[PDB]
mmCIF file of N, CA, C and O in Angstrom:
data_model
loop_
_atom_site.group_PDB
_atom_site.id
_atom_site.type_symbol
_atom_site.label_atom_id
_atom_site.label_comp_id
_atom_site.label_asym_id
_atom_site.label_seq_id
_atom_site.Cartn_x
_atom_site.Cartn_y
_atom_site.Cartn_z
ATOM 1 N N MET A 1 0.844 -1.181 0.000
ATOM 2 C CA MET A 1 0.000 0.000 0.000
ATOM 3 C C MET A 1 0.882 1.235 0.000
ATOM 4 O O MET A 1 1.703 1.416 0.906
ATOM 5 N N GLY A 2 0.715 2.072 -1.023
ATOM 6 C CA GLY A 2 1.508 3.273 -1.135
ATOM 7 C C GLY A 2 0.984 4.402 -0.275
ATOM 8 O O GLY A 2 -0.167 4.414 0.155
ATOM 9 N N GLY A 3 1.853 5.384 -0.052
ATOM 10 C CA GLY A 3 1.565 6.470 0.863
ATOM 11 C C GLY A 3 0.560 7.492 0.373
ATOM 12 O O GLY A 3 -0.348 7.179 -0.401
ATOM 13 N N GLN A 4 0.711 8.724 0.848
ATOM 14 C CA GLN A 4 -0.211 9.798 0.515
ATOM 15 C C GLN A 4 0.492 11.122 0.776
ATOM 16 O O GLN A 4 1.558 11.170 1.391
ATOM 17 N N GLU A 5 -0.114 12.198 0.280
ATOM 18 C CA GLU A 5 0.291 13.552 0.619
ATOM 19 C C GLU A 5 -0.919 14.294 1.160
ATOM 20 O O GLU A 5 -2.046 14.082 0.706
ATOM 21 N N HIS A 6 -0.673 15.162 2.143
ATOM 22 C CA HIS A 6 -1.768 15.829 2.837
ATOM 23 C C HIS A 6 -2.554 16.730 1.894
ATOM 24 O O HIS A 6 -3.783 16.628 1.806
ATOM 25 N N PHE A 7 -1.854 17.594 1.156
ATOM 26 C CA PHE A 7 -2.476 18.648 0.350
ATOM 27 C C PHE A 7 -3.503 19.445 1.144
ATOM 28 O O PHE A 7 -4.633 19.671 0.705
ATOM 29 N N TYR A 8 -3.093 19.861 2.335
ATOM 30 C CA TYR A 8 -3.690 21.016 2.978
ATOM 31 C C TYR A 8 -3.599 22.238 2.073
ATOM 32 O O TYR A 8 -2.543 22.533 1.509
ATOM 33 N N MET A 9 -4.726 22.939 1.926
ATOM 34 C CA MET A 9 -4.818 24.008 0.937
ATOM 35 C C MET A 9 -3.933 25.193 1.308
ATOM 36 O O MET A 9 -3.209 25.730 0.461
ATOM 37 N N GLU A 10 -3.984 25.626 2.562
ATOM 38 C CA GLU A 10 -3.086 26.679 3.005
ATOM 39 C C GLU A 10 -1.687 26.116 3.190
ATOM 40 O O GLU A 10 -1.507 25.054 3.779
ATOM 41 N N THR A 11 -0.692 26.837 2.696
ATOM 42 C CA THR A 11 0.681 26.376 2.773
ATOM 43 C C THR A 11 1.262 26.799 4.125
ATOM 44 O O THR A 11 0.603 27.461 4.927
ATOM 45 N N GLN A 12 2.507 26.418 4.389
ATOM 46 C CA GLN A 12 3.168 26.739 5.652
ATOM 47 C C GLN A 12 3.501 28.225 5.697
ATOM 48 O O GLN A 12 4.505 28.665 5.136
ATOM 49 N N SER A 13 2.668 29.000 6.389
ATOM 50 C CA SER A 13 2.869 30.429 6.584
ATOM 51 C C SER A 13 3.219 30.720 8.034
ATOM 52 O O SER A 13 2.604 30.165 8.945
ATOM 53 N N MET A 14 4.201 31.596 8.249
ATOM 54 C CA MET A 14 4.524 32.020 9.606
ATOM 55 C C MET A 14 5.262 33.351 9.583
ATOM 56 O O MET A 14 5.829 33.754 8.567
ATOM 57 N N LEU A 15 5.252 34.025 10.735
ATOM 58 C CA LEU A 15 6.013 35.245 10.956
ATOM 59 C C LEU A 15 6.654 35.177 12.335
ATOM 60 O O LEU A 15 6.046 34.672 13.280
ATOM 61 N N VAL A 16 7.888 35.657 12.443
ATOM 62 C CA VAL A 16 8.596 35.728 13.715
ATOM 63 C C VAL A 16 9.014 37.171 13.941
ATOM 64 O O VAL A 16 9.608 37.796 13.053
ATOM 65 N N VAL A 17 8.704 37.697 15.121
ATOM 66 C CA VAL A 17 8.946 39.089 15.470
ATOM 67 C C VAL A 17 9.822 39.152 16.714
ATOM 68 O O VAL A 17 9.382 38.760 17.798
ATOM 69 N N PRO A 18 11.053 39.643 16.623
ATOM 70 C CA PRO A 18 11.785 40.031 17.834
ATOM 71 C C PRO A 18 11.186 41.275 18.466
ATOM 72 O O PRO A 18 10.530 42.059 17.777
ATOM 73 N N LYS A 19 11.407 41.475 19.766
ATOM 74 C CA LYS A 19 10.821 42.588 20.503
ATOM 75 C C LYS A 19 11.791 43.721 20.790
ATOM 76 O O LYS A 19 11.356 44.866 20.931
ATOM 77 N N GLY A 20 13.087 43.446 20.864
ATOM 78 C CA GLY A 20 14.057 44.467 21.169
ATOM 79 C C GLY A 20 14.294 44.687 22.643
ATOM 80 O O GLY A 20 15.271 45.354 23.004
ATOM 81 N N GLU A 21 13.436 44.146 23.505
ATOM 82 C CA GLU A 21 13.621 44.203 24.946
ATOM 83 C C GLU A 21 13.397 42.812 25.510
ATOM 84 O O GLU A 21 12.427 42.144 25.142
ATOM 85 N N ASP A 22 14.310 42.376 26.380
ATOM 86 C CA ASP A 22 14.237 41.101 27.094
ATOM 87 C C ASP A 22 14.270 39.888 26.167
ATOM 88 O O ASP A 22 13.831 38.805 26.562
ATOM 89 N N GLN A 23 14.780 40.038 24.941
ATOM 90 C CA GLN A 23 14.858 38.938 23.975
ATOM 91 C C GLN A 23 13.499 38.294 23.728
ATOM 92 O O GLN A 23 13.411 37.111 23.407
ATOM 93 N N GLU A 24 12.426 39.057 23.882
ATOM 94 C CA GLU A 24 11.101 38.496 23.675
ATOM 95 C C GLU A 24 10.876 38.221 22.196
ATOM 96 O O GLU A 24 11.256 39.016 21.335
ATOM 97 N N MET A 25 10.259 37.080 21.903
ATOM 98 C CA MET A 25 10.100 36.604 20.534
ATOM 99 C C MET A 25 8.659 36.174 20.324
ATOM 100 O O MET A 25 8.234 35.147 20.861
ATOM 101 N N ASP A 26 7.906 36.945 19.554
ATOM 102 C CA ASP A 26 6.585 36.508 19.137
ATOM 103 C C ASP A 26 6.720 35.621 17.911
ATOM 104 O O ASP A 26 7.569 35.861 17.051
ATOM 105 N N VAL A 27 5.895 34.582 17.843
ATOM 106 C CA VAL A 27 5.914 33.635 16.738
ATOM 107 C C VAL A 27 4.464 33.412 16.337
ATOM 108 O O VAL A 27 3.746 32.645 16.984
ATOM 109 N N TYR A 28 4.022 34.082 15.284
ATOM 110 C CA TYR A 28 2.677 33.885 14.757
ATOM 111 C C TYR A 28 2.749 32.799 13.693
ATOM 112 O O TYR A 28 3.220 33.049 12.581
ATOM 113 N N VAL A 29 2.288 31.595 14.020
ATOM 114 C CA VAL A 29 2.469 30.454 13.127
ATOM 115 C C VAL A 29 1.176 29.654 13.052
ATOM 116 O O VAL A 29 0.492 29.457 14.060
ATOM 117 N N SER A 30 0.830 29.213 11.846
ATOM 118 C CA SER A 30 -0.424 28.503 11.598
ATOM 119 C C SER A 30 -0.211 26.990 11.695
ATOM 120 O O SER A 30 -0.416 26.234 10.748
ATOM 121 N N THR A 31 0.204 26.562 12.888
ATOM 122 C CA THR A 31 0.561 25.182 13.173
ATOM 123 C C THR A 31 -0.553 24.486 13.952
ATOM 124 O O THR A 31 -1.591 25.067 14.270
ATOM 125 N N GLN A 32 -0.332 23.207 14.248
ATOM 126 C CA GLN A 32 -1.245 22.423 15.069
ATOM 127 C C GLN A 32 -0.775 22.279 16.505
ATOM 128 O O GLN A 32 -1.557 21.847 17.356
ATOM 129 N N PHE A 33 0.479 22.622 16.789
ATOM 130 C CA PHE A 33 1.104 22.270 18.061
ATOM 131 C C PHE A 33 2.044 23.393 18.466
ATOM 132 O O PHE A 33 3.249 23.349 18.188
ATOM 133 N N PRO A 34 1.516 24.440 19.105
ATOM 134 C CA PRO A 34 2.367 25.573 19.498
ATOM 135 C C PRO A 34 3.420 25.227 20.524
ATOM 136 O O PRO A 34 4.415 25.958 20.629
ATOM 137 N N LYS A 35 3.239 24.145 21.285
ATOM 138 C CA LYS A 35 4.218 23.794 22.310
ATOM 139 C C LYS A 35 5.567 23.451 21.691
ATOM 140 O O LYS A 35 6.611 23.899 22.179
ATOM 141 N N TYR A 36 5.560 22.671 20.607
ATOM 142 C CA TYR A 36 6.802 22.352 19.910
ATOM 143 C C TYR A 36 7.465 23.602 19.366
ATOM 144 O O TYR A 36 8.689 23.728 19.417
ATOM 145 N N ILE A 37 6.673 24.513 18.796
ATOM 146 C CA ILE A 37 7.232 25.727 18.207
ATOM 147 C C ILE A 37 7.942 26.542 19.272
ATOM 148 O O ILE A 37 9.100 26.948 19.107
ATOM 149 N N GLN A 38 7.264 26.758 20.399
ATOM 150 C CA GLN A 38 7.858 27.502 21.497
ATOM 151 C C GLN A 38 9.110 26.809 22.015
ATOM 152 O O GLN A 38 10.137 27.457 22.245
ATOM 153 N N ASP A 39 9.054 25.484 22.160
ATOM 154 C CA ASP A 39 10.185 24.733 22.695
ATOM 155 C C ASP A 39 11.390 24.803 21.765
ATOM 156 O O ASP A 39 12.519 25.044 22.209
ATOM 157 N N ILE A 40 11.168 24.589 20.467
ATOM 158 C CA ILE A 40 12.276 24.558 19.522
ATOM 159 C C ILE A 40 12.876 25.948 19.345
ATOM 160 O O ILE A 40 14.096 26.092 19.227
ATOM 161 N N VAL A 41 12.044 26.994 19.355
ATOM 162 C CA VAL A 41 12.579 28.347 19.251
ATOM 163 C C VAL A 41 13.387 28.690 20.493
ATOM 164 O O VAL A 41 14.460 29.296 20.402
ATOM 165 N N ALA A 42 12.899 28.294 21.670
ATOM 166 C CA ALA A 42 13.646 28.552 22.893
ATOM 167 C C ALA A 42 14.986 27.830 22.886
ATOM 168 O O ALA A 42 16.011 28.409 23.257
ATOM 169 N N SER A 43 15.001 26.570 22.453
ATOM 170 C CA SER A 43 16.249 25.812 22.447
ATOM 171 C C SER A 43 17.211 26.329 21.385
ATOM 172 O O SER A 43 18.433 26.286 21.573
ATOM 173 N N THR A 44 16.680 26.811 20.258
ATOM 174 C CA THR A 44 17.533 27.343 19.200
ATOM 175 C C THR A 44 18.146 28.676 19.598
ATOM 176 O O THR A 44 19.334 28.913 19.362
ATOM 177 N N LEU A 45 17.357 29.551 20.213
ATOM 178 C CA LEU A 45 17.831 30.869 20.606
ATOM 179 C C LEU A 45 18.623 30.853 21.904
ATOM 180 O O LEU A 45 19.175 31.892 22.276
ATOM 181 N N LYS A 46 18.685 29.710 22.593
ATOM 182 C CA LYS A 46 19.247 29.602 23.940
ATOM 183 C C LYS A 46 18.558 30.586 24.889
ATOM 184 O O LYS A 46 19.164 31.517 25.419
ATOM 185 N N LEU A 47 17.261 30.364 25.078
ATOM 186 C CA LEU A 47 16.400 31.213 25.884
ATOM 187 C C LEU A 47 15.501 30.346 26.750
ATOM 188 O O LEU A 47 15.141 29.232 26.353
ATOM 189 N N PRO A 48 15.124 30.825 27.930
ATOM 190 C CA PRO A 48 14.032 30.184 28.661
ATOM 191 C C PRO A 48 12.707 30.444 27.967
ATOM 192 O O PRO A 48 12.479 31.514 27.403
ATOM 193 N N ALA A 49 11.810 29.464 28.055
ATOM 194 C CA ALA A 49 10.568 29.508 27.296
ATOM 195 C C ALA A 49 9.651 30.645 27.708
ATOM 196 O O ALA A 49 8.684 30.921 26.993
ATOM 197 N N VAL B 1 19.416 79.737 64.709
ATOM 198 C CA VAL B 1 18.495 80.562 63.933
ATOM 199 C C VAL B 1 18.219 81.878 64.644
ATOM 200 O O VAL B 1 18.257 82.951 64.029
ATOM 201 N N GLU B 2 17.951 81.827 65.950
ATOM 202 C CA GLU B 2 17.633 83.045 66.681
ATOM 203 C C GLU B 2 18.857 83.927 66.869
ATOM 204 O O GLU B 2 18.720 85.133 67.094
ATOM 205 N N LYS B 3 20.056 83.351 66.801
ATOM 206 C CA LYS B 3 21.249 84.181 66.694
ATOM 207 C C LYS B 3 21.350 84.813 65.312
ATOM 208 O O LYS B 3 21.868 85.926 65.176
ATOM 209 N N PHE B 4 20.857 84.126 64.276
ATOM 210 C CA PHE B 4 20.935 84.667 62.922
ATOM 211 C C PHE B 4 19.896 85.751 62.661
ATOM 212 O O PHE B 4 20.195 86.736 61.978
ATOM 213 N N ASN B 5 18.671 85.590 63.169
ATOM 214 C CA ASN B 5 17.609 86.550 62.874
ATOM 215 C C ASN B 5 17.875 87.934 63.450
ATOM 216 O O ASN B 5 17.267 88.906 62.993
ATOM 217 N N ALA B 6 18.743 88.047 64.450
ATOM 218 C CA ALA B 6 19.033 89.325 65.078
ATOM 219 C C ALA B 6 20.381 89.901 64.674
ATOM 220 O O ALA B 6 20.785 90.930 65.224
ATOM 221 N N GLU B 7 21.092 89.273 63.740
ATOM 222 C CA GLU B 7 22.355 89.807 63.243
ATOM 223 C C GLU B 7 22.313 90.106 61.753
ATOM 224 O O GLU B 7 23.357 90.403 61.162
ATOM 225 N N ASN B 8 21.139 90.028 61.131
ATOM 226 C CA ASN B 8 20.968 90.369 59.724
ATOM 227 C C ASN B 8 19.580 90.962 59.556
ATOM 228 O O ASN B 8 18.585 90.307 59.876
ATOM 229 N N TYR B 9 19.516 92.202 59.075
ATOM 230 C CA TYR B 9 18.238 92.893 58.981
ATOM 231 C C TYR B 9 17.408 92.404 57.800
ATOM 232 O O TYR B 9 16.180 92.325 57.898
ATOM 233 N N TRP B 10 18.044 92.095 56.675
ATOM 234 C CA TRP B 10 17.319 91.749 55.460
ATOM 235 C C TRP B 10 17.370 90.262 55.132
ATOM 236 O O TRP B 10 16.621 89.810 54.260
ATOM 237 N N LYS B 11 18.210 89.490 55.824
ATOM 238 C CA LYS B 11 18.424 88.075 55.527
ATOM 239 C C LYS B 11 18.009 87.243 56.737
ATOM 240 O O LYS B 11 18.713 87.230 57.751
ATOM 241 N N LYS B 12 16.888 86.529 56.620
ATOM 242 C CA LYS B 12 16.285 85.798 57.727
ATOM 243 C C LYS B 12 16.412 84.292 57.522
ATOM 244 O O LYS B 12 16.629 83.811 56.407
ATOM 245 N N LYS B 13 16.246 83.548 58.613
ATOM 246 C CA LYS B 13 16.207 82.088 58.610
ATOM 247 C C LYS B 13 14.919 81.604 59.275
ATOM 248 O O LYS B 13 14.073 82.396 59.689
ATOM 249 N N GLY B 14 14.767 80.288 59.368
ATOM 250 C CA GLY B 14 13.543 79.730 59.916
ATOM 251 C C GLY B 14 13.646 78.236 60.126
ATOM 252 O O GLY B 14 14.586 77.581 59.666
ATOM 253 N N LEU B 15 12.649 77.704 60.833
ATOM 254 C CA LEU B 15 12.565 76.287 61.158
ATOM 255 C C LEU B 15 11.102 75.909 61.342
ATOM 256 O O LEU B 15 10.295 76.718 61.804
ATOM 257 N N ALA B 16 10.760 74.676 60.973
ATOM 258 C CA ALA B 16 9.398 74.198 61.169
ATOM 259 C C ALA B 16 9.400 72.680 61.258
ATOM 260 O O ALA B 16 10.348 72.016 60.834
ATOM 261 N N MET B 17 8.314 72.137 61.809
ATOM 262 C CA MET B 17 8.155 70.695 61.961
ATOM 263 C C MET B 17 6.676 70.358 61.906
ATOM 264 O O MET B 17 5.867 71.013 62.565
ATOM 265 N N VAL B 18 6.328 69.341 61.126
ATOM 266 C CA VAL B 18 4.931 68.933 60.973
ATOM 267 C C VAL B 18 4.770 67.429 61.175
ATOM 268 O O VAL B 18 5.673 66.643 60.825
ATOM 269 N N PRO B 19 3.644 66.997 61.747
ATOM 270 C CA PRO B 19 3.340 65.571 61.873
ATOM 271 C C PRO B 19 2.499 65.058 60.710
ATOM 272 O O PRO B 19 1.908 65.822 59.946
ATOM 273 N N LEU B 20 2.436 63.731 60.602
ATOM 274 C CA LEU B 20 1.748 63.091 59.488
ATOM 275 C C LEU B 20 1.065 61.820 59.962
ATOM 276 O O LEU B 20 1.746 60.867 60.359
ATOM 277 N N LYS B 21 -0.274 61.821 59.911
ATOM 278 C CA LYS B 21 -1.118 60.632 60.024
ATOM 279 C C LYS B 21 -1.914 60.503 58.733
ATOM 280 O O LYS B 21 -2.878 61.243 58.515
ATOM 281 N N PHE B 22 -1.523 59.558 57.888
ATOM 282 C CA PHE B 22 -2.140 59.377 56.580
ATOM 283 C C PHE B 22 -2.993 58.118 56.576
ATOM 284 O O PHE B 22 -2.441 57.009 56.633
ATOM 285 N N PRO B 23 -4.316 58.226 56.514
ATOM 286 C CA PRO B 23 -5.153 57.028 56.381
ATOM 287 C C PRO B 23 -5.088 56.446 54.979
ATOM 288 O O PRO B 23 -4.921 57.165 53.993
ATOM 289 N N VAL B 24 -5.225 55.124 54.898
ATOM 290 C CA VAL B 24 -5.228 54.403 53.630
ATOM 291 C C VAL B 24 -6.515 53.599 53.555
ATOM 292 O O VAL B 24 -6.773 52.749 54.415
ATOM 293 N N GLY B 25 -7.319 53.858 52.532
ATOM 294 C CA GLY B 25 -8.564 53.135 52.365
ATOM 295 C C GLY B 25 -9.287 53.614 51.130
ATOM 296 O O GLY B 25 -8.875 54.573 50.473
ATOM 297 N N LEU B 26 -10.379 52.922 50.813
ATOM 298 C CA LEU B 26 -11.212 53.272 49.670
ATOM 299 C C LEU B 26 -12.665 53.424 50.092
ATOM 300 O O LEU B 26 -12.973 53.459 51.286
ATOM 301 N N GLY B 27 -13.562 53.504 49.113
ATOM 302 C CA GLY B 27 -14.974 53.703 49.376
ATOM 303 C C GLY B 27 -15.714 52.491 49.905
ATOM 304 O O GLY B 27 -16.169 52.493 51.052
ATOM 305 N N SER B 28 -15.842 51.448 49.087
ATOM 306 C CA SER B 28 -16.619 50.269 49.437
ATOM 307 C C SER B 28 -15.764 49.019 49.266
ATOM 308 O O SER B 28 -14.601 49.087 48.863
ATOM 309 N N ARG B 29 -16.358 47.868 49.590
ATOM 310 C CA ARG B 29 -15.632 46.601 49.541
ATOM 311 C C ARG B 29 -15.203 46.254 48.123
ATOM 312 O O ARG B 29 -14.078 45.791 47.905
ATOM 313 N N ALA B 30 -16.076 46.481 47.146
ATOM 314 C CA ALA B 30 -15.816 46.103 45.765
ATOM 315 C C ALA B 30 -14.727 46.935 45.108
ATOM 316 O O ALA B 30 -14.447 46.717 43.927
ATOM 317 N N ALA B 31 -14.116 47.876 45.820
ATOM 318 C CA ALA B 31 -13.043 48.694 45.278
ATOM 319 C C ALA B 31 -11.663 48.120 45.551
ATOM 320 O O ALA B 31 -10.668 48.704 45.117
ATOM 321 N N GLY B 32 -11.575 46.993 46.253
ATOM 322 C CA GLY B 32 -10.304 46.354 46.519
ATOM 323 C C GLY B 32 -10.070 45.029 45.832
ATOM 324 O O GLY B 32 -9.051 44.384 46.108
ATOM 325 N N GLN B 33 -10.969 44.586 44.949
ATOM 326 C CA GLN B 33 -10.783 43.315 44.261
ATOM 327 C C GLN B 33 -9.530 43.360 43.405
ATOM 328 O O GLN B 33 -9.321 44.310 42.648
ATOM 329 N N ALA B 34 -8.700 42.326 43.506
ATOM 330 C CA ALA B 34 -7.438 42.314 42.774
ATOM 331 C C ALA B 34 -7.162 40.915 42.254
ATOM 332 O O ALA B 34 -7.014 39.989 43.048
ATOM 333 N N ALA B 35 -7.066 40.761 40.936
ATOM 334 C CA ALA B 35 -6.833 39.462 40.322
ATOM 335 C C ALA B 35 -5.403 39.344 39.804
ATOM 336 O O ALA B 35 -4.658 40.320 39.738
ATOM 337 N N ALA B 36 -5.024 38.115 39.458
ATOM 338 C CA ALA B 36 -3.709 37.833 38.889
ATOM 339 C C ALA B 36 -3.767 36.484 38.191
ATOM 340 O O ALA B 36 -4.748 35.750 38.309
ATOM 341 N N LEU B 37 -2.690 36.146 37.485
ATOM 342 C CA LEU B 37 -2.668 34.897 36.734
ATOM 343 C C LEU B 37 -1.233 34.467 36.475
ATOM 344 O O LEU B 37 -0.438 35.250 35.953
ATOM 345 N N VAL B 38 -0.921 33.213 36.813
ATOM 346 C CA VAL B 38 0.443 32.693 36.818
ATOM 347 C C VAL B 38 0.510 31.409 35.997
ATOM 348 O O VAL B 38 -0.362 30.538 36.114
ATOM 349 N N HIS B 39 1.551 31.299 35.164
ATOM 350 C CA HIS B 39 1.850 30.127 34.353
ATOM 351 C C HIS B 39 3.235 29.609 34.702
ATOM 352 O O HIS B 39 4.154 30.398 34.930
ATOM 353 N N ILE B 40 3.389 28.287 34.701
ATOM 354 C CA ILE B 40 4.690 27.631 34.780
ATOM 355 C C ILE B 40 4.825 26.720 33.568
ATOM 356 O O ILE B 40 3.885 25.994 33.227
ATOM 357 N N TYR B 41 5.977 26.774 32.905
ATOM 358 C CA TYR B 41 6.221 25.986 31.705
ATOM 359 C C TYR B 41 7.062 24.755 32.039
ATOM 360 O O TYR B 41 7.528 24.580 33.166
ATOM 361 N N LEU B 42 7.239 23.889 31.036
ATOM 362 C CA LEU B 42 7.891 22.596 31.252
ATOM 363 C C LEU B 42 9.310 22.749 31.770
ATOM 364 O O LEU B 42 9.702 22.074 32.726
ATOM 365 N N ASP B 43 10.101 23.607 31.152
ATOM 366 C CA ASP B 43 11.322 24.033 31.802
ATOM 367 C C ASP B 43 10.928 25.023 32.883
ATOM 368 O O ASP B 43 9.984 25.798 32.716
ATOM 369 N N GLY B 44 11.630 24.967 34.008
ATOM 370 C CA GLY B 44 11.280 25.831 35.115
ATOM 371 C C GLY B 44 11.408 27.293 34.755
ATOM 372 O O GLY B 44 12.516 27.832 34.689
ATOM 373 N N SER B 45 10.265 27.940 34.533
ATOM 374 C CA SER B 45 10.187 29.332 34.120
ATOM 375 C C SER B 45 8.736 29.767 34.214
ATOM 376 O O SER B 45 7.840 29.005 33.851
ATOM 377 N N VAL B 46 8.517 30.992 34.684
ATOM 378 C CA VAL B 46 7.208 31.443 35.140
ATOM 379 C C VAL B 46 6.821 32.716 34.401
ATOM 380 O O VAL B 46 7.660 33.594 34.178
ATOM 381 N N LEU B 47 5.547 32.808 34.017
ATOM 382 C CA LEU B 47 4.983 34.009 33.412
ATOM 383 C C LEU B 47 3.798 34.477 34.245
ATOM 384 O O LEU B 47 2.794 33.770 34.349
ATOM 385 N N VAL B 48 3.904 35.674 34.812
ATOM 386 C CA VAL B 48 2.881 36.241 35.683
ATOM 387 C C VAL B 48 2.227 37.420 34.974
ATOM 388 O O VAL B 48 2.807 38.004 34.055
ATOM 389 N N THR B 49 0.992 37.734 35.360
ATOM 390 C CA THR B 49 0.352 38.976 34.943
ATOM 391 C C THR B 49 -0.747 39.347 35.929
ATOM 392 O O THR B 49 -1.572 38.506 36.287
#
């Protein structure tokens, strides 16, 4: 049995905004799981969540 | 000061002292309601508001 592709109509769109104070990082992302996004951005930036 | 006030006709000094009893309160009971909200994330780190 062969696989499949999702073909969700909306593509992967996101925006990341630094704040300029306290290394605050807004991440407006059209994902299903914001916890992973926050975790991976924190680990990449070397920041507490 | 009293040695100064009698040795200068145009140049005077002075002294004063005042007490302070300041009450702290509001109008009614519903004027002191105060809320807050605290989050803790998976890594030890806290967001308050």
